[model samples]
Target: QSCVWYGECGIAYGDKRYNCEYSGPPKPLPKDGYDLVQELCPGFFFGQVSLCCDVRQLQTLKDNLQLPLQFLSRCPSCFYNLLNLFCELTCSPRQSQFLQVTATEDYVDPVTNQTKTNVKELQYYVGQSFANAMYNACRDVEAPSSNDKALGLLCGKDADACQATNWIEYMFNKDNGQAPFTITPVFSDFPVHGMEPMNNATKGCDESVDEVTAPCSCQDCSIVC
Candidate 1:
């Protein structure tokens, strides 16, 4: 089934009665569908009629993000934090609350002769503390080439400069110069409902269990702010 406001794909989300289903292919993992989605996205309490991706898509997403580790490979906790944010934002059943489908493109399917809608532009919202903590967790790590922090490369400015504000602005000036995934940081205290700031243990950069859970050693990592 597909999520749509009306017509052929009609179902809707804001009003409930929508479910993101598995389109094709077998799941990569051995776990159950919803179970794997839950493992990928923690904040969500899965039920019927929700979620944006199935097990296949969720696992592929996690694998695809491996390269984005950039400097986040430093702390395991911080790495987990990043994955948590991404997974939840993309797969959460309540994504309707945080994600806005602003624009779409229509295309006729050659096989089915049915017109399909493609998301051309979309927007996502998150809490200030959650974004800040995600950045602070990697704030102090040094970039391999530059003496500045790795985030400096991502932010287009020095780490210290980024610390002055939210998520270091994600370096988005609305000119659409961002890379890979667009970055638009909204400076706000709270995110939409069903979400919270990832600023503490298990989600944030918690050093308390770093030795046990952290994969990257101090040899590579500096300090998590």
Candidate 2:
């Protein structure tokens, strides 16, 4: 299909929710508005695509990744995995299934005594194998943000603590307790509809897209890959 309009694209779970209620949409294939996923994250793109990111959100996500991308650029193996992970989380066709809009934050307007709500936390489900693999590959990565500490430093944990946790929490942050914009990871053994695991591109850029089964990067190599 060319492009999934505002209300056309969505996960199979069907709350009648498309990739976005007001922001993005899901597409069977990458079309005009959906093409930026490949632009932000090169090479890997498959399964399903939910264009949850408009140009602005896409740029912000890209810019926010500067630190991790820059640091891991030196390690092509790790770099490839990380990119796919972020890419999938944002644009995976099955995003609605794997990612749930769990909680929201409300702001009260003293003037009108009205309330404005915002997405507070998202609960994401991923394959356990995929989580393990991504973590092991980058555990050695030391970021300059804190005396060249393990990449886990960003997640507020050391290498060991990070390893004890899932890749998403370790790579990002284990801020499940409270949030205005926190993503909590839930590792599962089986597939979650639009969500599947991906195989690691050990050869980096040389690997084919078919190698990645899920909407994410599989360090433990994804199932169905």
Candidate 3:
């Protein structure tokens, strides 16, 4: 089967890269549109999404001069576990240490909404220097404005925005200093180490497609990053 963009892609789970197959409708109707977030990030945020189904195209095989589409499906959690495993396999011991340090220092305590400490460790200083270099290098790039309300909650704005008189009192004033990272307290409260994906998943679709599973083998599809 020929590979098409977003139809199929090469991916590695743990140490093994699989030319994985996705079982879904071949072509999207004229009314169908792409879901950028889900297509790019399958099984992100725990087992919240399905990988095999999410990564398929909307047209049939003949439209692209291919046979009727056939593929496999897996649990959303499997994709999640696969990603966390990738991080583990790729991250070295030193890198892991750095991750811990950064996670600890940058993590916003959900309860306190404040940084754990002002004490900057050696790793923190080194990491900051490297980070600043990258920041300056990318200064020419236009950055997008973040309007997600989640950021406000992450910054510890628990009160109603209308009642909060000043930006300083509610937004940046975490009872001490500026919010270290944009990570909200609620999200940070979870364990950072060894994040696992869910073991189950359901097929995803709009009103047009069926969520049932069947088996067949066909070729000529696309791949996505």
Candidate 1 lDDT over 1-225, as tens digits, reads 222121122223232112222223222233455565655565554335255555555555555564446766666665676676666545554445555555555645578887666443445565666666666566655655456566656665656667624443453233324322333444456654543332333444446433457544443355422
The 10-residue segment of model 2 with minimum total lDDT is 1-10
Clashing pairs in 2: 48-93, 133-220, 196-214, 197-214, 198-222
Q: Which stretches of candidate 1 lie over 4 Å from their true place?
A: 1-50, 144-147, 163-185, 191-202, 208-212, 215-225
Error of 3 at 105 (Å): 17
Q: Go through the candidates in order and give each one's C-alpha lDDT.
A: 0.49, 0.49, 0.23
> What number of backbone clashes does candidate 2 have, counting pairs of residues 3 or more apart or in separate chains?
5
Model 1 RMSD to the real structure? 8.0
Compare candidates 1 and 3 on TM-score and give the better one: 1
Over 89-119, each residue of candidate 2 has an lDDT whose tens digit, in order, gives: 6555445556667665454556886654444
Quick one: best TM-score, which candidate?
A: 1
Give me candidate 2's TM-score against the actual structure.
0.59
| lDDT (Cα, tens digit) per residue for candidate 3, span 1-225 | 111112322222222111222223222212232343233232231333222222232222112211101111122221222222222212111222222222222324467675333212111111222222222222121112322322133224432341212322232222423322211111122224442211122222111112342211111111110
Model 1, C-alpha of 213: deviation from truth (Å)? 0.5
Each model's number of backbone clashes? 0, 5, 18
